[PDB]
């Protein structure tokens, strides 16, 4: 599914849709929990390490400066959102 | 022959030998669930009720076929999304499995403000205004449509509805539910006229359709939202501790609703027991048949009571020598979850053919929800009949008579928009009654996928004995209205309703005097109506009950009592709820009071030029009904 | 008992021994003339009719008091002035003695353009547009209100009305006359609700009130104007040769109207002969009593017929053993020169108490105007009764029967706004009849000071024999509606009315198919109504005529026939003429045709979304009346 | 009445009303048939001379450059109006 998501993310940015708009399209098209829009690749690595460290139950795939996160329980989904807000 | 005591026993004897829980069990089998309006399983249960009416050997069975436009979920998922820090942080709250029918298809994004239940009082008692922001509201108190309308009235851009655990003690926090946000009844795309092929479906849109997207969310989704919101919900609201008031400064909510319309074929199934004296007059007994989920409590109990009431009354006529003077109609409506659509299209279609023939409607919908209280909402014409019924019908649990409060009529609430008996009374001028055995809290599983028979029998172990008393109440209603040459409708009950209106209006006599007006003619109308009802009781007293000519001369005056309260000065198409007592619109008597209350404040919320017209038409609507009840036109007074 | 032939003769004998000309003479005496609405002489004639009803020994006599707003002359004179060469040449045309009630008080100045009678067709077939100019129109063909409304619709700033000598052969060329320009009926400041004190008279203005000044001028004043106007009036119009079309280049007309409102007390006088079987149902016989001038032909003849009709029928009940099943109501309205105000306020006030009780209204107004023709305008339910009456009522002069045209019903015109029987039929759903002995030309002295008895008997020498036949027609109407167990109302007469509508609509089958619509459901409704009338006729055939219950069970279905044609989808306050056949508004069947007529022309006058709603609501109004007439609700089989 | 008209027209002109407006006021306040507004005082008598010669049944009074004409019959009133247009 990671292959399908990263390929759908390729088209939205090439078509000219904004990163913030593409984030909303991704959440309504796939079973993803939280998406973060980042500036440089440094924060993308910072955010990806931070969320995997504190919540290892989550699968995080990333493309360009947009990071996608898939988790399943309400409680874990809560922690991912709180972890992403803290490290942003 | 058979008197009332003989018929009361023959009804009570057949009630003990009736198994209601097995019928509700049959209506909740896998072949009839789920039955959303227009679905295949809806047509299956309709065909079953149609065959059951023939086996009961009623006088005639027929069906109506309507093509109404409903709203259903789309292939595109509805979503609730939180965005933080300029759209660079997004958080999926819920992809709800439920939806609100007749919501606007749009995507709104902005601040989220809590407004308690969404009533007009709740929006007034708020720190934050809801201008340009999304509103989240608890289910209850008022209908979904009223919540959306009050939010639209203050320029809100969206409404979210959830079920907190305090008012709805549900273990599953991820439970979705269903509703509709149409501020009216019937097919909202044929407002005021029937949804038949003859009309050829012209472009017409009801003014009750909202213009903002509204979505339902589970309690878990609402608690997801509260984690991004500030402010403590007041202790007055008596809600969960996780409750919050307003989102943070940099956090917004993106509501995405994409529901679509769907033209569907609905079926109304009918059965009639023709009368023996005046068969052109008849009582109507109805019960909603469709439901979003299984609808055991919402639709299953109602239809089960309707099926067995038709079986018992048909058995009494053929096997026990029952001879009702007027006829009895049993009706199983569809599309009830969208807003009494099946029943409204029948009224809007055959209004001419039942103008002064159908004189009472009994609604069995949601008659069994609990066991603590027995509540009733009905027209005052049926208050006396309801009081007489409660004095010889015993509570299933308590065993005592239902009549325990002598001031019960002063505590009755009027019929609401979501009740299938409301359009019968407010639009067609037919006296209606809705009753139920319930508790002080709402049945939590209504409109959900957990409205199953399993959850209904676990909450009500004596379901058969409770459903039997609900049939005994509705059964005694039908017998009292059809067997005697006199109608058990009490026209004198409106003297208290009129006197309460004149007294309530007289408290603002100070505002009236300074506008150069006087309530003296409204008192004159109340007294003229009181003497007309006293004269009719005298005429009924001195009447030879066997003289059929004098009796139906007096009965025709009684069946006109409810009709003469429909406002004669408003368009029934654009304002169908014409009843000045129980309808909606500026023509109603409560609307007159709300306007005059706005005068003491110096602001221009008062209209005056409207009030003077409201007072004029309301005064003559009462005076006109009084003069028609007094008798002939030449027997009227002049000053 | 007494059968029809016994009652026809018992009525005809008392008609010959009745002096009608002496009553018309009495109503034109100095004590009752002139009787403008609310005047002292108007109240005097009211007490005479009230006392005469007591002397006739009716079952009950009573009266209603209404407070309506009329319009009267001001202390400031109304003037018509011609201005030439930049206000430096002034020419007084007339300070008229007449006026138009409910005209706007204003002073307009500009071009004057002739528009013949002012009908919608006349304004369409005009070279010069009337936008921003004053319009002058001949009286007749249509009411004053229709003339003003059609001129306002094209942005006219004022209306002048005159009487040419061709249409009105009057010797006095300086004669002034009176009218009103309210496009409706009743007190125009209490639209839709009665003018009682209970309403406390809230601020409400009828949408039929014009917003341009309207004035009446004599023929001499019109010829003064034509001397300043160019262009020859077309020979199609058949008017005077002095007629002209449009003012000169530098000449304008200054119309100055300053009329004022006046709250007045009007009196409706009533008398009733109670029935013997079903007295709660009744027929109503009415006649206007007020008039601007003497109103001998307008009001005197009508009230005189009403007085003697009540005397004859009361004599028949007490002295000849007449026993009508239903009751009879005699009514003398006031404020009749205005928008039928006295009759409309009664309907708007007691609508609940006569909902399904009053089943016929007979209008005696202007029943004698000439002697050549016998004209009738009525609801189709009374066509059979009118035809049966014309077959045994002899013409006053010829002595031949009135029934001479076998295709007479196809030539009947519908009731107009100025007729007092129009609101009974178009608003309350009560079948109405208006009839008169008249000539092919309008009675010239109507609404003038020359509507005296002297001019009426001089033009109609056999006034007594003519007023007797007019009373015999109205008398036979009342007897046929009250003596038999059958109402003599013919519901089958609407089958031709519906068939005529479908035939007219079939002419636009090309337009209907082209918008994706179909006339098949309107075809079904026309047939379902035909079957409903056949089922009711069958039920009447198999009915035990002595069984009082089955007869009133069937009669109650007949008394609903006219009511079920009032549009249930319209506001009775803002559009009170709800009858889809005979009312006014977009809900009427002619309005459906008039709109669809605008589609075959490429122009964008057509309103599709309105027509689709018109066709929808009109289709179900017909189907609903058919389903209600078939019988019970469960006994309505259709090909739905 | 000639004195009353000449004095009432004097007041209208003294109050500041124009001659053209004062002409219309006289016709609706007095029993006047035709009023003509002229340039000089020579024309005022010339118009009055012309109208008195051809319609001697008319009483013609004049004040300043406004000439007032009173006639009673429809035909004579017509002839006066036509005479004033001819000589204006
Ligand atoms: C129902 O409404 C109608 C219409 O509004 C109303 O009729 C009007 O009533 C008033 C009050 O009685 C009438 O006015 C009076 O008329 C009489 C008759 O000439 C006069 O004598 C009165 O003069 C007295 O009052 C004056 C007040 O200033 C004094 O100045 C004077 O010196 C006298 O004391 C007064 O003008 C009016 O005429 C009628 N309207 C018509 C058209 O006649 C009626 O009263 C209302 N009914 C009820 C029960 O309220
Ligand atoms: C009364 O009105 C309804 C609503 O228009 C009519 O039902 C509709 O009838 C048409 C034609 O029979 C149906 O069209 C078909 O639609 C299906 C959709 O899958 C399509 O596959 C077919 O090729 C065809 O186009 C339409 O579906 C149907 N609508 C519904 C909701 O059932 C009805 O026929 C009318 N009745 C009469 C007597 O005119
Ligand atoms: C107080 O309430 C009254 C209603 O009783 C409001 O009067 C309403 O005012 C509007 C606007 O003037 C009217 O709309 C008009 O409709 C006519 C219909 O043809 C149209 O021609 C006009 O151009 C205009 O659009 C409306 O009819 C009128 N209603 C009534 C009953 O008179 C009034 O506006 C309210 N006041 C306030 C401050 O809200
Ligand atoms: C064509 O007719 C329709 C139907 O009357 C008009 O639509 C109405 O427009 C007014 C003003 O917007 C609304 O108050 C009504 O509710 C509308 N009625 C309906 C059924 O939509 C429309 O304005 C007309 N068009 C023209 C150009 O006259
Ligand atoms: C009438 O309408 C025409 C067409 O626009 C215009 O030229 C003319 O000036 C108008 N006249 C008046 C008096 O409004
Ligand atoms: Ca509808
Ligand atoms: Ca009125």
């Amino acid at each position: 599914d990671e292959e399908e998501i990263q390929k759908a993310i390729e088209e939205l940015l090439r078509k000219g849709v904004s990163e913030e708009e593409a984030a909303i399209i991704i959440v309504q098209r796939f079973n993803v929990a939280v998406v973060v829009v980042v500036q440089d690749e440094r924060q993308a690595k910072h955010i990806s390490e931070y969320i995997r460290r504190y919540i290892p139950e989550a699968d995080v795939i990333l493309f360009a400066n947009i990071v996608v996160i898939k988790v399943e329980t309400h409680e874990l989904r809560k922690r991912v959102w709180e972890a992403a807000q803290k490290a942003y | 022959r058979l008197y009332w005591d003989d018929l009361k026993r023959k009804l009570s004897e057949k009630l003990d030998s009736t198994d209601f829980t097995s019928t509700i069990k049959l209506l909740n089998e896998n072949s009839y669930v789920p039955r959303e309006a227009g679905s295949q399983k809806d047509e299956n249960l309709a065909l079953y009720v149609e065959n059951q009416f023939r086996e009961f050997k009623l006088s005639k069975v027929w069906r109506d076929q309507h093509f109404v436009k409903i709203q259903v979920k789309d292939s595109a998922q509805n979503s609730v999304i939180i965005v933080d820090k300029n759209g660079r942080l997004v958080y999926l709250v819920e992809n709800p499995g439920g939806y609100v029918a007749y919501s606007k298809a749009a995507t709104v994004t902005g601040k989220l403000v809590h407004a308690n239940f969404g009533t007009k009082k709740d929006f007034e008692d708020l720190y934050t205004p809801v201008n340009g922001s999304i509103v989240i509201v608890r289910a209850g108190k008022i209908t979904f449509a009223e919540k959306v309308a009050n939010a639209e009235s203050l320029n809100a851009i969206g409404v979210l509805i959830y079920m907190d655990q305090t008012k709805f003690p549900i273990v599953n926090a991820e439970l979705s539910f269903f509703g509709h946000a149409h501020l009216g009844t019937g097919d909202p795309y044929t407002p005021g006229f029937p949804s038949f092929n003859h009309t050829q479906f012209p472009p017409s849109r009801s003014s009750g359709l909202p213009n903002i997207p509204v979505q339902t969310i589970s309690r878990a989704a609402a608690e997801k939202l509260f984690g991004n919101m500030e402010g403590d919900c007041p202790s007055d609201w008596k809600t969960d501790s996780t409750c919050r008031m307003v989102t943070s400064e940099s956090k917004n909510v993106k509501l995405t609703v994409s529901n679509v319309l769907k033209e569907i074929k609905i079926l109304n199934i009918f059965g009639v027991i023709k009368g023996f004296v005046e068969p052109d007059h008849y009582v109507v007994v109805g019960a909603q048949r469709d439901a979003w989920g299984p609808g055991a409590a919402k639709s299953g109990v109602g239809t089960a009571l309707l099926l067995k009431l038709a079986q018992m009354f048909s058995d009494m006529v053929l096997k026990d020598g029952f001879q009702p003077s007027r006829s009895i109609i049993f009706a199983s409506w569809s599309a009830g979850d969208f807003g009494s659509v099946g029943a409204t299209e029948w009224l809007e279609g055959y209004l001419s053919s039942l103008h002064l023939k159908a004189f009472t409607y009994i609604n069995l919908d949601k008659a069994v929800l609990g066991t603590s209280n027995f509540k009733v909402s009905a027209s005052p014409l049926l208050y006396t009949l309801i009081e007489k019924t409660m004095q010889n019908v015993k509570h299933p649990v308590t065993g005592q008579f239902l009549y325990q409060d002598s001031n019960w009529a002063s505590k009755v609430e009027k019929l609401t928009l979501d009740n299938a008996a409301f359009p019968f009374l407010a639009y067609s001028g037919i006296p209606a009654v809705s009753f139920c055995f319930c508790e002080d809290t709402d049945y939590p599983y209504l409109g959900t996928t957990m409205d199953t028979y399993k959850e209904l029998i676990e909450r009500i172990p004596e379901l058969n004995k409770v459903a039997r008393a609900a049939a005994e109440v509705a059964g005694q209603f039908v017998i009292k209205l059809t067997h005697d040459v006199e109608l058990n409708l009490d026209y004198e009950r409106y003297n208290s309703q009129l006197l309460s209106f004149v007294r309530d209006l007289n408290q603002y006599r100070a505002d009236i005097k300074e506008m150069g007006l006087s309530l003296q003619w409204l008192y004159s109308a109340r007294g003229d109506f009181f003497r007309a009802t006293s004269r009719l009781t005298t005429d009924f007293g001195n009447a030879e009950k066997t003289d059929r000519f004098v009796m139906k001369k007096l009965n025709d005056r009684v069946m006109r009592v409810e009709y003469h309260f429909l406002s004669p000065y408003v368009s029934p198409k654009e304002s169908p709820f014409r009843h000045v007592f129980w309808g909606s619109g500026s023509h109603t008597l409560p609307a007159l009071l709300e306007n005059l209350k706005l005068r003491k404040q110096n602001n221009g919320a008062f209209n005056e030029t409207l009030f003077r017209n409201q007072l004029a038409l309301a005064t003559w609507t009462i005076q006109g009904a009084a003069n028609a009840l007094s008798g002939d036109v030449w027997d009227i007074d002049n000053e």
Side-chain angles (χ1 to χ4, degrees), chain B residues 229-250:
Chain B
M229 301 173 62
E230 300 174 313
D232 281 8
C233 300
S235 57
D236 307 357
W237 297 5
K238 292 190 178 185
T239 183
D240 306 358
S241 57
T242 55
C243 184
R244 294 296 180 264
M245 292 293 302
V246 169
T247 55
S248 300
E249 185 275 339
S250 56

Side-chain angles (χ1 to χ4, degrees), chain B residues 141-209:
Chain B
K141 295 301 183 197
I142 59 180
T143 60
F144 282 8
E146 287 180 277
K147 305 173 187 288
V148 184
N150 298 330
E152 258 187 301
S153 175
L154 307 191
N155 302 314
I157 69 179
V159 174
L160 303 178
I161 309 179
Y162 75 97
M163 295 192 298
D164 66 326
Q165 200 194 341
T166 297
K167 186 175 217 303
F168 302 88
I170 297 196
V171 195
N172 189 2
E174 305 265 4
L175 183 62
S176 54
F177 56 99
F178 167 82
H180 82 85
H182 174 222
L183 196 58
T185 64
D187 186 5
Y189 290 87
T190 61
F193 62 96
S195 294
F196 280 118
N197 287 71
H198 308 62
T199 62
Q200 271 170 116
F201 306 110
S204 196
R205 203 172 189 265
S206 170
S207 57
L209 287 179

Side-chain angles (χ1 to χ4, degrees), chain A residues 19-21 23-24 27-28 30-38 73-74 77-78 81 84-86 88, chain B residues 77 79 81-92 95 174 220-221 223-224 227-228 251 254 256:
Chain A
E19 307 180 323
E20 293 84 330
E21 291 175 322
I24 302 169
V27 302
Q28 303 166 338
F30 297 101
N31 186 27
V32 313
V34 170
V35 174
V36 176
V37 178
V38 164
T73 76
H74 166 105
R77 214 171 279 242
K78 197 189 196 71
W81 178 240
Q85 294 182 97
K86 187 168 170 48
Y88 179 80
Chain B
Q77 183 72 52
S79 70
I81 299 173
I82 288 183
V83 290
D84 194 351
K85 274 147 189 184
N86 292 318
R88 305 192 168 79
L89 296 178
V90 301
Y91 178 29
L92 181 55
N95 290 329
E174 305 265 4
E223 287 177 359
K224 279 192 187 179
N228 300 263
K251 303 183 185 181
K254 171 173 275 291
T256 298

Side-chain angles (χ1 to χ4, degrees), chain A:
Chain A
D1 51 355
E2 159 168 5
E3 264 197 86
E4 263 199 356
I5 298 174
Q6 283 181 342
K7 290 181 178 182
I9 301 178
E10 289 176 358
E11 300 199 342
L12 283 179
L13 289 172
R14 291 301 91 99
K15 287 191 185 70
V17 183
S18 174
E19 307 180 323
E20 293 84 330
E21 291 175 322
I24 302 169
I25 301 172
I26 293 174
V27 302
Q28 303 166 338
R29 276 174 56 183
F30 297 101
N31 186 27
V32 313
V34 170
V35 174
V36 176
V37 178
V38 164
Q39 179 196 2
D40 44 327
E41 78 280 1
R42 307 183 198 171
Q43 299 176 358
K45 167 89 133 53
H46 176 34
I47 302 305
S48 59
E49 288 180 17
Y50 193 95
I51 292 168
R52 283 194 289 262
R53 179 192 320 167
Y54 287 10
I55 308 141
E57 299 89 337
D59 282 13
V60 288
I61 74 163
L62 58 85
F63 183 92
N65 44 338
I66 294 175
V67 178
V68 172
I69 311 168
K70 297 181 72 173
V71 81
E72 267 296 40
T73 76
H74 166 105
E75 292 297 339
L76 288 173
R77 214 171 279 242
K78 197 189 196 71
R79 281 168 52 194
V80 171
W81 178 240
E82 300 171 347
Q85 294 182 97
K86 187 168 170 48
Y88 179 80

Side-chain angles (χ1 to χ4, degrees), chain B residues 60 62 64-65 192-194 196-204 272 274-275 277-282 327 329 346 348-357 512 516-519 521 524 528 548 552-553 556-557 560 563-564 568-574 608-609 612-613 615-617 619-620 623-628 631-639:
Chain B
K60 196 179 185 304
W62 74 100
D64 280 329
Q65 198 162 299
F193 62 96
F196 280 118
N197 287 71
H198 308 62
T199 62
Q200 271 170 116
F201 306 110
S204 196
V272 57
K274 287 191 83 170
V277 174
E278 315 173 59
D280 45 323
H281 305 324
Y282 45 92
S327 305
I329 291 188
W346 190 69
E348 287 178 355
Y350 303 93
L351 182 55
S352 68
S353 189
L354 44 61
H355 169 41
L356 288 176
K357 316 296 206 176
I512 292 161
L517 295 174
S518 176
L519 292 181
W521 289 283
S524 290
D528 285 327
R548 295 181 294 100
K552 310 193 199 311
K553 170 198 177 60
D556 283 359
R557 301 225 291 268
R560 284 163 163 253
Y563 164 75
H564 283 135
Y569 312 102
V570 296
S571 168
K573 179 180 169 66
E574 299 187 314
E608 171 157 7
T609 54
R612 302 184 100 99
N613 280 263
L615 179 67
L617 282 50
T619 294
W620 200 248
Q623 185 75 60
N627 293 18
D632 301 324
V633 178
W634 43 84
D635 296 327
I636 310 182
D637 55 7
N638 68 321
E639 84 281 355

Side-chain angles (χ1 to χ4, degrees), chain B residues 264-301:
Chain B
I264 68 169
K265 168 176 65 180
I266 60 177
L267 290 188
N268 292 335
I269 310 301
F270 295 98
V272 57
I273 301 182
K274 287 191 83 170
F276 287 87
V277 174
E278 315 173 59
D280 45 323
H281 305 324
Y282 45 92
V283 182
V284 179
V285 180
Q288 172 188 2
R289 167 166 44 85
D290 70 309
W292 182 72
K298 168 178 295 183
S299 157
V301 170

Side-chain angles (χ1 to χ4, degrees), chain B residues 430-548 550-587:
Chain B
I430 303 178
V433 52
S434 185
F435 65 98
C436 65
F437 291 98
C438 66
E439 273 87 51
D440 304 321
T441 53
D442 304 335
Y443 191 87
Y445 310 130
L446 281 182
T448 69
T449 57
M450 288 204 299
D451 193 0
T452 56
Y453 176 60
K454 173 184 169 297
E455 279 300 325
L456 180 65
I457 186 60
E458 285 177 8
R459 295 175 83 83
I460 309 180
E462 312 275 332
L463 179 67
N464 201 84
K465 202 171 186 178
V466 173
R468 182 208 158 276
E472 188 177 25
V473 169
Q476 289 201 15
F477 284 169
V478 175
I479 300 185
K480 272 297 196 68
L481 294 165
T482 53
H483 78 268
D484 199 328
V485 297
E486 301 199 27
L487 304 169
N488 277 273
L489 295 177
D490 189 14
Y491 40 84
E492 296 191 2
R493 285 289 190 165
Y494 268 111
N495 294 320
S496 62
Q497 298 282 345
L498 285 172
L499 180 53
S500 301
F501 173 64
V502 186
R503 290 183 190 266
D504 196 0
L505 190 48
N506 196 84
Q507 294 190 328
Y508 309 101
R509 188 173 55 90
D511 292 319
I512 292 161
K513 180 199 178 179
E514 48 190 19
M515 299 179 43
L517 295 174
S518 176
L519 292 181
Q520 68 170 264
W521 289 283
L522 217 174
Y523 281 94
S524 290
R526 186 213 76 85
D528 285 327
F529 189 89
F530 188 94
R531 293 176 281 267
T533 54
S534 295
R535 183 177 298 158
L536 183 54
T537 297
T538 290
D539 291 7
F540 263 103
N542 303 309
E544 181 60 42
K545 278 64 187 174
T546 71
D547 194 350
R548 295 181 294 100
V550 179
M551 288 308 292
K552 310 193 199 311
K553 170 198 177 60
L554 294 179
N555 285 337
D556 283 359
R557 301 225 291 268
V558 171
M559 304 186 305
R560 284 163 163 253
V561 171
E562 196 76 72
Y563 164 75
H564 283 135
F565 282 139
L566 306 182
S567 181
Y569 312 102
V570 296
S571 168
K573 179 180 169 66
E574 299 187 314
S575 294
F577 304 143
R578 289 185 294 153
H579 205 292
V580 300
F581 281 97
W582 320 117
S584 302
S586 56
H587 53 276

